[PDB]
Amino acid sequence: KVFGRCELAAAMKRHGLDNYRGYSLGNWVCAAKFESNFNTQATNRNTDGSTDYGILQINSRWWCNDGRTPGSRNLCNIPCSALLSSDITASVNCAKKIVSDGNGMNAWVAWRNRCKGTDVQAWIRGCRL
Ligand SMILES: [Br-]
Ligand SMILES: [Br-]
Ligand SMILES: [Br-]
Ligand SMILES: [Br-]
Ligand SMILES: [Br-]
Ligand SMILES: [Br-]
Ligand SMILES: [Br-]
Ligand code: NA
C-alpha cells in the first residue's frame, strides 16, 4: 500500500510512535518517506547477505528471520514478511526495540543523512491532527 503524507502520520500516532524515546512524529514520517516513499512493500538487499523490509527497512541480521541469513539473530521474534503488511503494527513494535538498543534513531542511515537537523515538522504541515 502506498500511504499518503497525512495518512501515514495519523497511523504512526495511533500506534504511540509520536515522541517515543524523544523523537517527534515528523522524524518518523521523514524517515519513512526517504526509506520507502510511503510504500509498505519495499525491500532492499544488503552487502553481507541481509535484507531490509518494510516502510522503515528493518534489517534481518538481528531483528527478524528470513531464513537466508546465516549466523544471525531474531531479537524481535518475528518473520521478516510481517513487516510488509498494509498494517504497520509489526514494523512499529520492532522499531521500538531497535531504537532502544543504545544508539537511538541513528540505526537508520537515511534518517541521519536526510532528516537529522532539518525542518521535520513540515512533513506534517496542513494535516488534521
Ligand atoms: Br509527499
Ligand atoms: Br514534528
Ligand atoms: Br537465517
Ligand atoms: Br534467495
Ligand atoms: Br536471538
Ligand atoms: Br495502519
Ligand atoms: Br537517543
Ligand atoms: Na535473522
Instruction: Give the domain extent around 23.
Output: 5-124
The C-alpha cell of 15 is what?
500506534
Residue 115, domain CATH = 1.10.530.10
Q: Per the domain annotation, does 129 fall within a domain?
A: no
**Binding-site residues for substrate:** 101
Residue 67 lies in a domain: yes
What resolution, expressed in A, was reported for this entry? 1.9
Question: Does 63 map to a domain?
Answer: yes
From 7, 18, 48, 52, the catalytic residue: 52
Query: Has 119 been annotated as catalytic?
Result: no
How many Å apart are CA 57 and CA 91, to the nearest integer?
9
User: Does the annotation count 35 as an active-site position?
Assistant: yes
Method: X-ray
Q: How many helices (H) and strands (E) does the chain have?
A: 4, 3
Catalytic entry in 18, 35, 87, 119: 35
Q: Could you give the number of structural domains in the chain?
A: 1
Instruction: Quote the ligand 8 centre to 57 CA distance (angstroms).
Output: 14
**CA-CA distance, 60 to 16, in Å (whole number)?**
24
